[PDB]
Amino acid sequence: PHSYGIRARTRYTFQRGFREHGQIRLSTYLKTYKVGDIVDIKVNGAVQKGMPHKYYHGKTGVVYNVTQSSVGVLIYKVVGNRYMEKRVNVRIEHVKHSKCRQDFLDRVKANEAKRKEAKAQGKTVQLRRQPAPPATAHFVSTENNEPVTLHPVAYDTTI
Amino acid sequence: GIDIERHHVRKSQRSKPASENVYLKLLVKLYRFLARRTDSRFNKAILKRLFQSKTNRPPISISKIAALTSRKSASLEGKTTVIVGTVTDDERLLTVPKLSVAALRFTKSARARILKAGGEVLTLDQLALRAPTGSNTVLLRGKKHAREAYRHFGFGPHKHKAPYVRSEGRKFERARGRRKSRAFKV
Amino acid sequence: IAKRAESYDAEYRKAEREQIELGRKARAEGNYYVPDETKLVFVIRIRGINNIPPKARKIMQLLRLIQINNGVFVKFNKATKEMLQVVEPYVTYGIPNLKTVRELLYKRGFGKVNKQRIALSDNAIIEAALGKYSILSIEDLIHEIYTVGPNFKQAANFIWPFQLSSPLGGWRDRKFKHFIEGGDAGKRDEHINSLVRKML
Amino acid sequence: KNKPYPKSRYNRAVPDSKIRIFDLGRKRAGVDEFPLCIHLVSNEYEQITSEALEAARICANKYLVKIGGKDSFHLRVRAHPFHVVRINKMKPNGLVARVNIGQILMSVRTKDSSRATAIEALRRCQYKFPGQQRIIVSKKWGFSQYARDEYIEKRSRGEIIPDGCYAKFLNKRGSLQEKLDLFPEASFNLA
Amino acid sequence: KSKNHTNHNQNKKAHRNGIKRPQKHRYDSLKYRDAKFRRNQKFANRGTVEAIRQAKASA
Amino acid sequence: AHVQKKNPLKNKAVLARLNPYAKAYKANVKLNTGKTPKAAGEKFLTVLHEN
Amino acid sequence: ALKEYQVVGRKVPTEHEPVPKLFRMRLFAPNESVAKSRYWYFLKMINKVKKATGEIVAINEISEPKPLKAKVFGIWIRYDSRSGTHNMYKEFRDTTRVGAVEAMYADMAARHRARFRSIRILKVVEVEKKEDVRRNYVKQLLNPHLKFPLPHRRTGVVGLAGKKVFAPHRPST
RNA sequence: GAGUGUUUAUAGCCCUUGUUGUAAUACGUCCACUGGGGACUGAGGACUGCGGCUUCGUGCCAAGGAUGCUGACAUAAUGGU
RNA sequence: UCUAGUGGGCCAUUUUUGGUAAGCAGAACUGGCGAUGCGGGAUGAACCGAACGUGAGGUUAAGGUGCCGGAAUGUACGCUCA
RNA sequence: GAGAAGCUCAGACGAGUAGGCAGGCGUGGAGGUUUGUGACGAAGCCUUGGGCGUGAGCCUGGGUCGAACAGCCUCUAGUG
RNA sequence: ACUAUGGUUGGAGACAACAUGGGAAUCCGGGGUGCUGUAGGCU
């Protein structure tokens, strides 16, 4: 008895947060979006116009079109053995910037600064990231930190 | 038991021509040695195209050769043009320039017009004699998708391809499914 | 090459003596000396190609462990540690010593040149493959594998995965339990050396 | 193994439950009284029926009424039937209670001189329940979450005041004036 | 009995040839953009091409 | 070329063709030509035999 | 084959805790890897440390100080049966506390069908006084005048000569 | 002959330390350190590709795949049906 | 680009729904049989091991070592008389 | 040189129903070719003999037999 | 607590232990009771 409505099985997906109903913060309408920006789609239940489908909730895409009150987001969805391009017109109330883009920008700026300093001082670059390295030898001391001998505890009910 | 994925294992290229033309076999024999004993990629390209089928070797016109070799930013004044295929004649080109063209075969009209215009026609073996490594040669090929099958290939909803019809005009696939006045459009 | 081998051998002995002396100093002074966590890990696939989940199968393909009794060298970082955690039931891994590394590369040493498995019967093959990384012999190839250097990725990828035989004396009573439980799966620390010795 | 199926606006026509009284004996006892507690815990997951719950409750009450008197026990049933079991007609059929690990079924608080018969009552009623059960001498003071030694130590200071069956305790919050007016014997040391 | 829907083999069938990603192109069609934006960009590109061609010719 | 693989660990000639240092390699060299003391420590011994 | 290891570990120092406490325990494990695994298994019960959030700073095998003298070992253990968790105390006469532990594991497996995973060794002590030795069968071995015949076995095979299929005469005892 | 109740006597146990310890033994690890016993294989088919000895000899070698010395049979033996 | 066959599925682990339950019916994940031979579970489509060109030698997996049956009437500690 | 449609070196791999492709074996007839076979025995048939190929199949020794038959390159089909 | 992965683990089962990993909530206790620009006025 499945139903294929637009907002089917969206009882909790579109719900406002607890003690977060009512007025919508106005900084969302002041955010600036440009073509090529990486944005996150998070549907707001208070706004029904421009509502994207439940599939695109929690999905990250690239802005391709900009209108008066909404934005065009490009998404890739699996339709079997291939990805398909989906162009969703979403109002800015359901659109937020991805903080990963800002982190990427900060990383690039840091890399450029280190590269400029290395060129000026004639030193190495050493800019690529590294995974969690193995631990180096330390010198764990015992003074004022005498080891405490432990033994398994016997079975004693506490009820 | 070994867990190895075999997807691009058997090569899908041609290692020899499908035709039985003895003269084409001789040309393949010459250019096999040329491509193997020279580091020039021109010889390898010629050898690969010698294997190609007729549909993969479209003809090219003398007008197309003249248009490509007479570009402003081309610097192609008196160098040889190479086509692995047939050179046809474009009668719309009333005045043929002087061209040096090497081709697998020429049409009678194209060869006559090239010779009349002060140009020269050479075969692939003659081209190998003149330019063993293909130096200063303009290598071209005909339009592969100019064939009639490619206007039908990829037909489907909203693909704007040519359908397979037995005739032309109304009463032939210009009804429901092809206009908004009849149910839906494409 | 001989001078390089002499320097490598002296470096190995110096490192071993330094570790021993540091441990002795810690024991004498009553403190604790925690040594460096290992950087090189030898991984042997113990499970066949039957009934493998897609994620574990993909990891073993990316680790080039596509056959039972196959061994590879990896550098131990967070990414490889998590991958080995996922494929824990199907592989064993541990810290190999110099004897295990050199015996593997001398007996089962096969390089990948032109996507072909060619035995390392001459230093010319190694020099041709890895000469741009100053690896001209089996000895400095062993040095690069043992001491994880700059071109460890190239040195380890050049070596074809080792095709080990079945262990002499067999495995434990049940093979597909964890090493802690008494099986032959998961981390076994230095016991990988004994396993490789039986499997070589 | 089925999901819980209680009575609601979607499952209305359900047969009535069988156990109506869950407390038997001196319900209005005191915290100072009954310094010993006995619990009948379950060591495995069960699906105890309301029929078994009422039968064991009746058996326990009829055994307790003639060994120490009607005013010596506070037997309480700690299992409530909330799951509806359906049956195709030969569609609710009955009501059962789902019991987890270490859940108490029956609780009796008595004096230290009645511990043997308090254990015996639950031992006799163990035969009326499906599965296995255990009898535990609770370390807490009756129904109070505190321990016996901790409760008497705090009562010596005066931080606990009885109120009917249970009591009220001193907590580190609330108006100071109300706390002083409600706990006169409590010595509020300045620390 | 009919109506035998299942998804046991569908994931394996999809991954047999993998989940293919669409080809990425440098330029996308302007039919997906705003009509006013595309109309103005036509003239802007036309002037840019004219200016570039004039620069190449004169210089 | 290379019709048959010889194990360097078994064939000394191949073990010499590779690894030129093998001839000059030395092992089992004594390094205990001294008093050779003990580094145990009373604290370490007490912790070891604590319980 | 079991061995006794003393294992000392701690939690990885953090911003709030720059000097974590060091915890030591003695564990009877076949190898060091099992010993460290047992250390983390027992530490997770009381402390909030894990293998990822902790590190082992020492592991040392302990040998018997007097392997050539007979001792009495009292072992307190906590084990899980098919019904509940029990605490037992047992006495074993052995020259090595590791051997006493192995004898304890064999005895528990033989009697209560208890596996290694279901047994926790709470404490092992050496009892040098018969006033604290409580098992009568262990105490009967401490009398100065102890004598008994050889336990009833299958007689002496003596080398390969006992591998003959047939025998010319009946055996004698 | 059956029993006290003081600690080496006509014996000796247990726990500390000094010493002649670099005193020894088991265990782990390594040796490009060294001895034997057994089995299967001998693919390739003029030469070409490293180390040592110098006898400076496109000489020798276990170094890019077995040769050498013998014997018995030959209406036997090994093979095929 | 062209085209074949398919469009009755079934078994096992795990998560479950309807049923008293079913070798029942209907869903999700993974591995399989279908199309999978071989060693083991005495016998077997699914279970364990392991995925197969023709052979020699060696070593194993799961499983076993009283005989049938290849392999210790092996070692150590206990329990049990039905 | 090695029927270049050839010669030579090296590495990896090998389950398979429905189904797809390629290379081959066999039969009848047609064109070309083989100083082709044959009444001093063609075809066919029997065979407790031999040989080749992984295989479809092929060659051959010994009997019977009496009048036609085959190899190679192509063509073709009422071809297993 | 719960949970991903494993066993020819235990148990008749329900479930439980163990092994390699991840890791809550309610309660209780300690602390706190808003931060943030431009242009100007006030013994």
PDB file of C-alpha atoms in Angstrom, chain G residues 34-161:
ATOM      1  CA  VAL G  34      47.293 -11.863  24.691  1.00  0.00           C
ATOM      2  CA  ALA G  35      48.692 -10.351  27.898  1.00  0.00           C
ATOM      3  CA  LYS G  36      48.201  -6.806  26.598  1.00  0.00           C
ATOM      4  CA  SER G  37      44.732  -7.730  25.327  1.00  0.00           C
ATOM      5  CA  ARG G  38      43.847  -9.066  28.782  1.00  0.00           C
ATOM      6  CA  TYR G  39      45.228  -5.878  30.347  1.00  0.00           C
ATOM      7  CA  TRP G  40      42.929  -3.691  28.245  1.00  0.00           C
ATOM      8  CA  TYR G  41      40.014  -6.067  28.849  1.00  0.00           C
ATOM      9  CA  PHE G  42      40.421  -5.765  32.626  1.00  0.00           C
ATOM     10  CA  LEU G  43      41.192  -2.029  32.545  1.00  0.00           C
ATOM     11  CA  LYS G  44      37.987  -1.245  30.632  1.00  0.00           C
ATOM     12  CA  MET G  45      35.940  -2.533  33.583  1.00  0.00           C
ATOM     13  CA  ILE G  46      37.131   0.006  36.174  1.00  0.00           C
ATOM     14  CA  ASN G  47      38.756   2.847  34.214  1.00  0.00           C
ATOM     15  CA  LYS G  48      37.588   4.786  31.158  1.00  0.00           C
ATOM     16  CA  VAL G  49      40.667   3.897  29.097  1.00  0.00           C
ATOM     17  CA  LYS G  50      40.729   1.968  25.824  1.00  0.00           C
ATOM     18  CA  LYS G  51      43.450   0.679  23.525  1.00  0.00           C
ATOM     19  CA  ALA G  52      42.912   3.682  21.246  1.00  0.00           C
ATOM     20  CA  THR G  53      42.898   6.103  24.199  1.00  0.00           C
ATOM     21  CA  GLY G  54      45.692   4.358  26.125  1.00  0.00           C
ATOM     22  CA  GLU G  55      49.211   3.020  25.741  1.00  0.00           C
ATOM     23  CA  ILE G  56      51.260   0.208  27.271  1.00  0.00           C
ATOM     24  CA  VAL G  57      54.450   1.542  28.851  1.00  0.00           C
ATOM     25  CA  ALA G  58      55.925  -1.766  30.066  1.00  0.00           C
ATOM     26  CA  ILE G  59      55.501  -5.519  29.709  1.00  0.00           C
ATOM     27  CA  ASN G  60      57.876  -7.939  31.438  1.00  0.00           C
ATOM     28  CA  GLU G  61      57.747 -11.709  31.815  1.00  0.00           C
ATOM     29  CA  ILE G  62      58.110 -12.862  35.432  1.00  0.00           C
ATOM     30  CA  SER G  63      59.829 -16.156  36.231  1.00  0.00           C
ATOM     31  CA  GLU G  64      59.456 -18.097  39.460  1.00  0.00           C
ATOM     32  CA  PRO G  65      61.994 -16.895  42.066  1.00  0.00           C
ATOM     33  CA  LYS G  66      62.217 -20.432  43.523  1.00  0.00           C
ATOM     34  CA  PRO G  67      61.236 -22.903  40.777  1.00  0.00           C
ATOM     35  CA  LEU G  68      62.998 -25.768  42.594  1.00  0.00           C
ATOM     36  CA  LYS G  69      60.958 -25.797  45.823  1.00  0.00           C
ATOM     37  CA  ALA G  70      57.423 -27.021  46.452  1.00  0.00           C
ATOM     38  CA  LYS G  71      54.856 -24.371  47.388  1.00  0.00           C
ATOM     39  CA  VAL G  72      51.116 -24.090  47.995  1.00  0.00           C
ATOM     40  CA  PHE G  73      49.224 -21.551  45.882  1.00  0.00           C
ATOM     41  CA  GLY G  74      45.779 -20.208  46.733  1.00  0.00           C
ATOM     42  CA  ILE G  75      43.852 -18.823  43.772  1.00  0.00           C
ATOM     43  CA  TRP G  76      40.752 -16.651  44.068  1.00  0.00           C
ATOM     44  CA  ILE G  77      38.789 -16.616  40.809  1.00  0.00           C
ATOM     45  CA  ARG G  78      35.489 -15.265  39.517  1.00  0.00           C
ATOM     46  CA  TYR G  79      33.848 -17.218  36.702  1.00  0.00           C
ATOM     47  CA  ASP G  80      30.553 -17.235  34.817  1.00  0.00           C
ATOM     48  CA  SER G  81      28.564 -20.470  34.740  1.00  0.00           C
ATOM     49  CA  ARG G  82      25.525 -21.242  32.581  1.00  0.00           C
ATOM     50  CA  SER G  83      23.325 -19.568  35.232  1.00  0.00           C
ATOM     51  CA  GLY G  84      25.253 -16.860  37.082  1.00  0.00           C
ATOM     52  CA  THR G  85      28.590 -15.461  38.255  1.00  0.00           C
ATOM     53  CA  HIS G  86      30.395 -17.242  41.095  1.00  0.00           C
ATOM     54  CA  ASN G  87      33.510 -16.667  43.200  1.00  0.00           C
ATOM     55  CA  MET G  88      35.659 -19.650  44.175  1.00  0.00           C
ATOM     56  CA  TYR G  89      38.921 -20.233  46.011  1.00  0.00           C
ATOM     57  CA  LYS G  90      41.154 -23.192  45.179  1.00  0.00           C
ATOM     58  CA  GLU G  91      44.458 -24.580  46.431  1.00  0.00           C
ATOM     59  CA  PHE G  92      47.155 -26.204  44.303  1.00  0.00           C
ATOM     60  CA  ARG G  93      50.577 -27.523  45.295  1.00  0.00           C
ATOM     61  CA  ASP G  94      53.167 -26.591  42.674  1.00  0.00           C
ATOM     62  CA  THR G  95      56.707 -25.287  42.299  1.00  0.00           C
ATOM     63  CA  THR G  96      55.574 -22.477  39.966  1.00  0.00           C
ATOM     64  CA  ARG G  97      52.637 -20.092  40.265  1.00  0.00           C
ATOM     65  CA  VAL G  98      52.221 -20.272  36.483  1.00  0.00           C
ATOM     66  CA  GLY G  99      51.965 -24.054  36.747  1.00  0.00           C
ATOM     67  CA  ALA G 100      49.421 -23.654  39.538  1.00  0.00           C
ATOM     68  CA  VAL G 101      47.382 -21.362  37.277  1.00  0.00           C
ATOM     69  CA  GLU G 102      47.539 -23.907  34.444  1.00  0.00           C
ATOM     70  CA  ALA G 103      46.440 -26.619  36.876  1.00  0.00           C
ATOM     71  CA  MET G 104      43.580 -24.360  37.981  1.00  0.00           C
ATOM     72  CA  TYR G 105      42.431 -23.874  34.383  1.00  0.00           C
ATOM     73  CA  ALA G 106      42.592 -27.622  33.728  1.00  0.00           C
ATOM     74  CA  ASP G 107      40.664 -28.407  36.919  1.00  0.00           C
ATOM     75  CA  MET G 108      37.926 -25.849  36.214  1.00  0.00           C
ATOM     76  CA  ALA G 109      37.535 -27.134  32.653  1.00  0.00           C
ATOM     77  CA  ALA G 110      37.418 -30.738  33.873  1.00  0.00           C
ATOM     78  CA  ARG G 111      34.896 -30.127  36.665  1.00  0.00           C
ATOM     79  CA  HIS G 112      32.707 -27.113  35.848  1.00  0.00           C
ATOM     80  CA  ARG G 113      33.251 -27.148  32.050  1.00  0.00           C
ATOM     81  CA  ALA G 114      34.480 -23.556  32.315  1.00  0.00           C
ATOM     82  CA  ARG G 115      36.384 -22.145  29.352  1.00  0.00           C
ATOM     83  CA  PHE G 116      39.275 -19.687  29.475  1.00  0.00           C
ATOM     84  CA  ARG G 117      37.076 -16.777  28.368  1.00  0.00           C
ATOM     85  CA  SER G 118      34.663 -17.255  31.293  1.00  0.00           C
ATOM     86  CA  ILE G 119      37.303 -17.322  34.067  1.00  0.00           C
ATOM     87  CA  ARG G 120      38.833 -14.252  35.725  1.00  0.00           C
ATOM     88  CA  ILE G 121      41.831 -14.777  38.019  1.00  0.00           C
ATOM     89  CA  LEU G 122      41.141 -12.389  40.900  1.00  0.00           C
ATOM     90  CA  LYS G 123      44.304 -13.134  42.884  1.00  0.00           C
ATOM     91  CA  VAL G 124      47.069 -15.716  43.271  1.00  0.00           C
ATOM     92  CA  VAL G 125      48.960 -15.923  46.573  1.00  0.00           C
ATOM     93  CA  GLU G 126      51.493 -18.310  48.091  1.00  0.00           C
ATOM     94  CA  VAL G 127      50.504 -19.890  51.413  1.00  0.00           C
ATOM     95  CA  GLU G 128      53.539 -20.871  53.496  1.00  0.00           C
ATOM     96  CA  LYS G 129      51.536 -21.736  56.632  1.00  0.00           C
ATOM     97  CA  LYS G 130      49.284 -24.722  57.286  1.00  0.00           C
ATOM     98  CA  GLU G 131      47.216 -22.520  59.615  1.00  0.00           C
ATOM     99  CA  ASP G 132      45.970 -20.702  56.497  1.00  0.00           C
ATOM    100  CA  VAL G 133      46.014 -23.744  54.196  1.00  0.00           C
ATOM    101  CA  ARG G 134      42.377 -24.847  54.223  1.00  0.00           C
ATOM    102  CA  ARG G 135      42.075 -27.705  51.711  1.00  0.00           C
ATOM    103  CA  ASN G 136      42.437 -31.031  53.508  1.00  0.00           C
ATOM    104  CA  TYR G 137      43.909 -32.876  50.519  1.00  0.00           C
ATOM    105  CA  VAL G 138      46.529 -30.152  50.039  1.00  0.00           C
ATOM    106  CA  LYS G 139      47.303 -30.097  53.771  1.00  0.00           C
ATOM    107  CA  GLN G 140      47.795 -33.881  53.814  1.00  0.00           C
ATOM    108  CA  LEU G 141      50.828 -33.369  51.545  1.00  0.00           C
ATOM    109  CA  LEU G 142      52.597 -31.191  54.143  1.00  0.00           C
ATOM    110  CA  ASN G 143      53.101 -33.869  56.806  1.00  0.00           C
ATOM    111  CA  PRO G 144      56.780 -34.810  57.299  1.00  0.00           C
ATOM    112  CA  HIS G 145      56.005 -38.549  57.024  1.00  0.00           C
ATOM    113  CA  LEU G 146      54.244 -38.861  53.659  1.00  0.00           C
ATOM    114  CA  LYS G 147      54.293 -42.170  51.795  1.00  0.00           C
ATOM    115  CA  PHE G 148      52.029 -43.872  49.259  1.00  0.00           C
ATOM    116  CA  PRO G 149      52.393 -46.464  46.481  1.00  0.00           C
ATOM    117  CA  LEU G 150      52.768 -45.518  42.849  1.00  0.00           C
ATOM    118  CA  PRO G 151      49.460 -44.432  41.264  1.00  0.00           C
ATOM    119  CA  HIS G 152      47.811 -47.189  39.245  1.00  0.00           C
ATOM    120  CA  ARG G 153      49.037 -46.701  35.670  1.00  0.00           C
ATOM    121  CA  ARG G 154      49.510 -48.908  32.593  1.00  0.00           C
ATOM    122  CA  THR G 155      52.929 -50.222  33.755  1.00  0.00           C
ATOM    123  CA  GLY G 156      56.184 -49.270  32.050  1.00  0.00           C
ATOM    124  CA  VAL G 157      56.335 -49.386  28.261  1.00  0.00           C
ATOM    125  CA  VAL G 158      60.119 -48.793  28.400  1.00  0.00           C
ATOM    126  CA  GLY G 159      61.428 -47.608  25.040  1.00  0.00           C
ATOM    127  CA  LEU G 160      60.367 -49.030  21.690  1.00  0.00           C
ATOM    128  CA  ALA G 161      60.262 -52.611  23.019  1.00  0.00           C
TER     129      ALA G 161
END
